[PDB]
Amino acid sequence: LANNVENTAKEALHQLAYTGREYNNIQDQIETISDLLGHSQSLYDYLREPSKANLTILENMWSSVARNQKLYKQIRFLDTSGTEKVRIKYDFKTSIAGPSLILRDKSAREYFKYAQSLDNEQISAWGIELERDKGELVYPLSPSLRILMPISVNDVRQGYLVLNVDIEYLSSLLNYSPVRDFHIELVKHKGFYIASPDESRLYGDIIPERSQFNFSNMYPDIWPRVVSEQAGYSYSGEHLIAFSSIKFVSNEPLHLIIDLSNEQLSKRATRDINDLIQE
Numbered sequence: 001l002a003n004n005v006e007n008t009a010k011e012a013l014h015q016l017a018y019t020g021r022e023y024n025n026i027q028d029q030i031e032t033i034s035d036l037l038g039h040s041q042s043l044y045d046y047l048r049e050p051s052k053a054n055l056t057i058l059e060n061m062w063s064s065v066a067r068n069q070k071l072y073k074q075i076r077f078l079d080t081s082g083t084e085k086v087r088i089k090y091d092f093k094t095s096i097a098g099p100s101l102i103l104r105d106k107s108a109r110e111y112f113k114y115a116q117s118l119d120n121e122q123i124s125a126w127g128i129e130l131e132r133d134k135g136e137l138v139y140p141l142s143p144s145l146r147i148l149m150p151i152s153v154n155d156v157r158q159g160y161l162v163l164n165v166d167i168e169y170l171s172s173l174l175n176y177s178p179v180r181d182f183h184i185e186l187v188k189h190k191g192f193y194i195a196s197p198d199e200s201r202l203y204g205d206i207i208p209e210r211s212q213f214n215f216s217n218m219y220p221d222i223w224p225r226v227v228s229e230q231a232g233y234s235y236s237g238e239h240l241i242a243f244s245s246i247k248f249v250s251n252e253p254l255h256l257i258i259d260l261s262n263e264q265l266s267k268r269a270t271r272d273i274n275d276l277i278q279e
């Protein structure tokens with residue numbers, strides 16, 4: 001063991017660096033596309049002349065962008081009062097995008113009050129937070145990182161572009177490595193889980209029956225190492241945890257964790273290329 005724990009920890013550290021680079025790339029892709037949507041001719045045309053015809057052109061464009069990019073669960077334009085005016089929804093499982101006529105007043109949401117505080121054409125983002133409809137949680141639960149940009153015409157604010165980056169999709173895309181056979185969990189700065197192969201530990205800050213699933217409660221002596229935002233590992237005698245930190249469209253850290261119990265560690269002793277084949 002001792003050496004096998006260590007060798008596994010070294011592999012997991014490589015995996016954490018790999019996956020951190022993938023999130024950094026996703027962030028660059030989101031920054032670029034948010035800037036293009038906020039400066040787009042189709043949106044400009046609609047805001048100048050919000051005819052049904054121009055709304056259709058905008059909706060078709062956003063639906064195309066959602067199908068092409070996959071990581072936006074919604075793309076919306078809210079007016080200055082916080083009422084949704086344009087709302088494209090995308091479902092990654094089916095690949096269907098299209099507009100909804102279910103348009104709500106979002107003015108009570110904190111992410112909206114934050115967007116109002118931004119300058120014209122300034123792109124910023126809200127912390128990861130579950131989606132809601134009329135204040136009720138959307139189920140299945142939907143953690144979103146909302147990109148926010150007030151949009152102006154001749155210096156007069158028209159509303160806000162809002163893009164909901166779908167953390168469940170990104171987790172599904174990024175957080176399992178078939179070659180190294182590792183699952184990466186995402187743990188927020190507050191200690192609660194927003195992605196895991198174990199669904200039952202998610203969102204303990206929101207779901208009462210899960211409030212025990214905080215990394216700081218689970219691994220009190222390992223938590224400080226994670227909070228340091230350095231990459232490293234710790235082994236408690238029962239779990240090997242390898243950890244790293246990134247900043248993903250946020251000034252707060254997001255911690256990426258590979259947590260393997262003794263039982264799981266024993267088995268990768270067996271690992272052979274023939275195991276990878278071909279699944």
Ligand SMILES: [Cl-]
Pocket residue numbers: 106109132133134135136
């Ligand atoms: Cl709401």
